[PDB]
């Protein structure tokens, strides 16, 4: 009956069995199934897609089509009634730095991107969505509810375009619509190096055989480097300040400029790559460009994997870490390494950890100038504030010394993202990321909240009283029930995010299960997992073991005061130490002596 593999959007299947290095595309990781976890393939389906017409149309598409006998609520109405709040006082996470937020976003961009469709980059269909708020084909606009303030100042809707799907660019009736993952499923620094050979070659410094990445030849972080500019026009980063006219950066990932701390994180990974490569070269003068690009790329991939699994995941998953991600037992070629469709929503727990302001700090970690603290919404697609307002060092001090927002059932997403989000082509700081998330859940054919509770062996509330006990919140349960009518219909993003956090974690039981399963799979299903025998030497792993975000800052900035534990909330100078006391990455176990 069922086939195995639709697809024209394959590049070239050209696997070197003897290769010590990853492909850029993620092909050839699994020997038995070589396209497994490759980029530009369908997101994995842990559960069958749920569409209004069983094939492709989202729930909420046809006004007269219920879900389980109830109209699905407007995404923007759920956002206004449940996700929004006014008072930023007391919202900050008393034991997570802002870098905890920022690393989450970095790891997400390494693992998944479902890009919006393109059957019109030169069309009236392009602007007919924003202009006329007309639903059709890939235009699935987020309509405003009657009492919405934006109805008064912004028109009838927020334009929204359906995510791209695998096989055919326009129509496809082969089976259910499957959304694409444009990046590699492996935790492999694809966001630094790219997931397509072309982008991957557009980015490298070939002009020297030192295996360095291409840099900005127009601005430097006072003796450091900038990501090159995407000189492609029109530029959203130019458009936010036509005076400054500073373009977006060019990274392995097209999202790198979305906000200034993401652009900052990415800058450090371009720079850290050079610091490793040059260290490699001074130690192995005989090695050519490739061995230094490929080998440098392999240590950085290993760095991300370690920071993610050693430092990041244990303070997300808390008491649930050991349950879902037990100590590593080695590579299992039967594990599916593909990112699931649901994971791309689960991992959006990060939107509730984003605070309303970003700060630039000085060597005493004190306000940097008179406009040191800036509203987050002024920093979307903002590269001019890095280049013309003192490079990345002051932002990096903020990442260390400021705190993440804490998820709060009564203060979910800051209005900087819920009302003032900036998106390219669109001209306003007027988008709602929460509403977008809910619309996207439906766009992607997501099973509802109880399908996912069932998937994770958790109770399935069917009444108001049921929902109250699971959320441990009467008022929140009552608002969701008024909007959704049955818990079966709660969109996974808001359902999962609404659950009280697990002991010593930052997500509830459902998300702990979904995130935990996915992370276990991307480690165990990865033939190039840093700690898989034959990837690194027993001695390198003693030394790759040394790596730190604390150390990565010290070694690629002019910052000399850092916490040891950079994801915990750190207050200067009390919880801060001098850089000298921080275990460095001894690359002596990479020393090559052939002759
Ligand atoms: C200021 C910070 C951030 C901004 C401005 C931002 C913005 C966005 C936007 C605009 C989208 C696309 C929404 C859509 O069209 O469906 C998105 C998706 C996403 N965000 Fe965020 N985000 C932020 C922080 C984070 C954090 C901290 C995390 C995780 C810890 C995260 C995880 C995700 C994930 C997984 C997706 C879906 C990616 C995909 O497969 O396409 N984001 N974000
Ligand atoms: C690739 O690397 C070379 C060598 O590291 C870069 O050229 C150096 O950088 C600046 C010019 O921007 C000069 O002051 C140095 O003296 C240059 N050295 C050499 C040996 O050329 C070059 O800019 C990089 N190329 C790109 C496109 O990023
Ligand atoms: C490699 O992973 C596979 C699949 O995740 C494991 O296969 C499981 O085997 C158990 C017990 O033998 C079976 O009951 C299940 O059918 C499989 N797992 C799942 C999730 O359904 C396999 O055991 C793993 N190999 C090793 C050595 O751990
Ligand atoms: C644009 O950038 C310039 C510096 O290049 C700055 O002085 C000015 O305040 C910026 N304007 C806006 C609206 O951001
Ligand atoms: C803060 O988080 C860390 C984990 O990084 C934990 O070990 C520590 O006990 C926490 N501190 C407080 C005060 O709860
Ligand atoms: Ca990747
Ligand atoms: Zn400097």
Curated annotation (Swiss-Prot):
Compartment annotation: Secreted; Cytoplasm
Expression across tissues: Mammary gland; milk.
Site (Transition state stabilizer): 255
GO cellular-component term (any): basolateral plasma membrane
GO biological process terms, semicolon-separated: antibacterial humoral response; defense response to bacterium; detection of chemical stimulus involved in sensory perception of bitter taste; hydrogen peroxide catabolic process; response to oxidative stress
Positions contributing to heme b binding: 108, 258, 351
GO molecular function: calcium ion binding; heme binding; lactoperoxidase activity; peroxidase activity; thiocyanate peroxidase activity
Cystine pairings recorded for this chain: 6-167, 15-28, 129-139, 133-157, 237-248, 456-513, 554-579
Superkingdom as given in the UniProt entry: Eukaryota
Cofactor note as given: Binds 1 Ca(2+) ion per heterodimer.
Residues binding Ca(2+): 110, 184, 186, 188, 190
Any further remark recorded for this protein: Thiocyanate (SCN(-)) and hypothiocyanite (OSCN(-)) are bound in the distal heme cavity. The iodide ion (I(-)) occupies a position which is stabilized by the interactions with heme moiety, His-109, Arg-255 and Glu-258. Hydrogen peroxide is held between the heme iron and His-109.
Family membership: Belongs to the peroxidase family. XPO subfamily.
Function: Heme-containing oxidoreductase which catalyzes the conversion of thiocyanate (SCN(-)) into antimicrobial agent hypothiocyanous acid (OSCN(-)) in the presence of hydrogen peroxide (H2O2). Also involved in the conversion of iodide (I(-)) into hypoiodite (IO(-)) in the presence of H2O2. Responsible for the inactivation of a wide range of micro-organisms and hence, important component of defense mechanism. The lactoperoxidase-SCN(-)-H2O2 system shows antibacterial properties against some streptococci strains. The lactoperoxidase-I(-)-H2O2 system shows antibacterial properties against E.coli.
The protein, known as: Lactoperoxidase
Organism: Bos taurus (Bovine)
Gene of this entry: LPO
Residues shown, of full length: 118 to 712 of 712
């Amino acid at each position: 009956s069922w086939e195995v593999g639709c697809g024209a959007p394959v590049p070239l299947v050209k696997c070197d069995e003897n290769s010590p290095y990853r492909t850029i595309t993620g092909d050839c990781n699994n020997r038995r199934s070589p396209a497994l976890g490759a980029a530009n393939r369908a997101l994995a389906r842990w559960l069958p897609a749920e569409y209004e017409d069983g094939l492709a149309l989202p729930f909420g598409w046809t006004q007269r089509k219920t879900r389980n006998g109830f109209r699905v609520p407007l995404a923007r109405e759920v956002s206004n009634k449940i996700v929004g709040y006014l008072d930023e006082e007391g919202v900050l996470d008393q034991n997570r730095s802002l870098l905890f937020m920022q690393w989450g976003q970095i790891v997400d961009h390494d693992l998944d991107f479902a890009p919006e469709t393109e059957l019109g980059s030169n069309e009236h269909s392009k602007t007919q969505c924003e202009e006329y708020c007309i639903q059709g084909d890939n235009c699935f606009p987020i309509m405003f509810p009657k009492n919405d303030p934006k109805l008064k100042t912004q028109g009838k809707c927020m334009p929204f375009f359906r995510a791209g799907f695998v096989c055919p660019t326009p129509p496809y009736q082969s089976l259910a619509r499957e959304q694409i993952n444009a990046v590699t499923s492996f935790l492999d620094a694809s966001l630094v190096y790219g997931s397509e050979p072309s982008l991957a070659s557009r980015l490298r410094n070939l002009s020297s055989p030192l295996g360095l990445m291409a840099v900005n030849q127009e601005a430097w972080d006072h003796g450091l480097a900038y990501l090159p500019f995407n000189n492609k026009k029109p530029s959203p980063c130019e458009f936010i300040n036509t005076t400054a006219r500073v373009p977006c950066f060019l990274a392995g990932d097209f999202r790198a400029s979305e906000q200034i701390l993401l652009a900052t994180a990415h800058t450090l990974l371009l720079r850290e790559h050079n610091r490793l490569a040059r260290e490699l070269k001074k130690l192995n003068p005989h090695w050519n460009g490739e061995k230094l690009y490929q080998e440098a790329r392999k240590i950085l991939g290993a760095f991300i994997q370690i920071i993610t699994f050693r430092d990041y995941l244990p303070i997300v998953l808390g008491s649930e870490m050991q349950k879902w991600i037990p100590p590593y037992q080695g590579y299992n070629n039967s594990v599916d390494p593909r990112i699931s469709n649901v994971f791309t929503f689960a991992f959006r727990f990060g939107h509730m950890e984003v605070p309303s302001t970003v700060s630039r700090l000085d060597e005493n970690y004190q306000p940097w100038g008179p406009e040191a603290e800036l509203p987050l919404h002024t920093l979307f697609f903002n590269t001019w504030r890095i280049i013309k307002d003192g490079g990345i060092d002051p932002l990096v001090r903020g990442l260390l010394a400021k705190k993440s927002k804490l998820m709060n059932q009564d203060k979910m997403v800051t209005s900087e993202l819920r009302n003032k989000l900036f998106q390219p082509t669109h001209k306003i700081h007027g988008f709602d990321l929460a509403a977008i998330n809910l619309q996207r859940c439906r766009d992607h054919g997501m099973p509802g909240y109880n399908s996912w509770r069932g998937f994770c062996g958790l109770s399935q509330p069917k009444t108001l009283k049921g929902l109250q006990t699971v959320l441990k919140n009467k008022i929140l349960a009552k608002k969701l029930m008024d909007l959704y009518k049955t818990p079966d219909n709660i969109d996974i993003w808001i359902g999962g995010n609404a659950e009280p956090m697990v002991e010593r974690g930052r997500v509830g039981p459902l998300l702990a299960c979904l995130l935990g399963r996915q992370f276990q799979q991307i480690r165990d299903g990865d033939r190039f997992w840093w700690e898989n025998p034959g990837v690194f030497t027993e001695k390198q792993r003693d030394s790759l073991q040394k790596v730190s975000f604390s150390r990565l800052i010290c070694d690629n900035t002019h910052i000399t005061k850092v916490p040891l534990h950079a994801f915990q909330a750190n207050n200067y100078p009390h919880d801060f130490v001098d850089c000298s006391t921080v275990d460095k990455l001894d690359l002596s176990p990479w020393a090559s002596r052939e002759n």
